[PDB]
Design a protein around this nucleic acid. Structure first.
Lengths: 55, 55, 55, 55
DNA sequence: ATGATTGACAATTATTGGAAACCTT
DNA sequence: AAGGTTTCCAATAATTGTCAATCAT
């Protein structure tokens, strides 16, 4: 009902943050690594995956 | 080709720092608000209209 | 500045500036090598010679 | 001073230089601009050109 | 109130610029 | 010699991690 998903300001240090209300209510998304899907002009971030290219 | 993308490492406590490569390549100013839509376990990060900015 | 056919400034003493992303794209370290060749009147920059599997 | 196809070592830097023979043949300024373009995994640098980002 | 989340600041590392040394006509 | 080129070092700054303050139930 709050600002769980829609838009948020990016930090001046170049960091995007997850809405407080979202993470504070449902920790259904961990933080450490994520999959970057560059869909033309939109960056879709999915759950972390191995995808190891080299040791 | 399958459901996979670029493996990005962010902060283990949060701070979703999008790829530095794309940041400078596309020229994404990190001083405004970016759209963040939650889709199950993935989040769509984009601008109001990134397909009509440098175009 | 990506290599999408974009020009960039050289240097007061003449030095080809390699952008962060470009350096990372080539996969070269601060202990690598670059083969400088020429085609007609253009500079052909070739990455380091692996000659070994990624291990 | 032909250095056509010379392997330049990359030390603790990030950017490199262009061989004297190539530099002289280029016929450009010291602080000129080189058109950076890619080729699979190699790079093709042409002479100055009015090519700007998003323009 | 207290533990967890987020934003701010600081430290580290990468890159670009400049100065110095060596080479060549 | 001296002008040119290249290599090394220093400075700048962008980025990521740490963590301390605050708020929600």
């Amino acid at each position: 009902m709050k600002s769980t998903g829609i838009v948020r300001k990016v930090d001046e240090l170049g960091r995007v943050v997850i809405p407080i209300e979202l993470r504070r209510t449902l920790g259904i998304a961990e933080k450490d690594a994520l999959e970057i899907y560059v869909d033309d002009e939109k960056i879709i971030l999915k759950k972390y995956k191995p995808n190891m290219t080299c040791q």
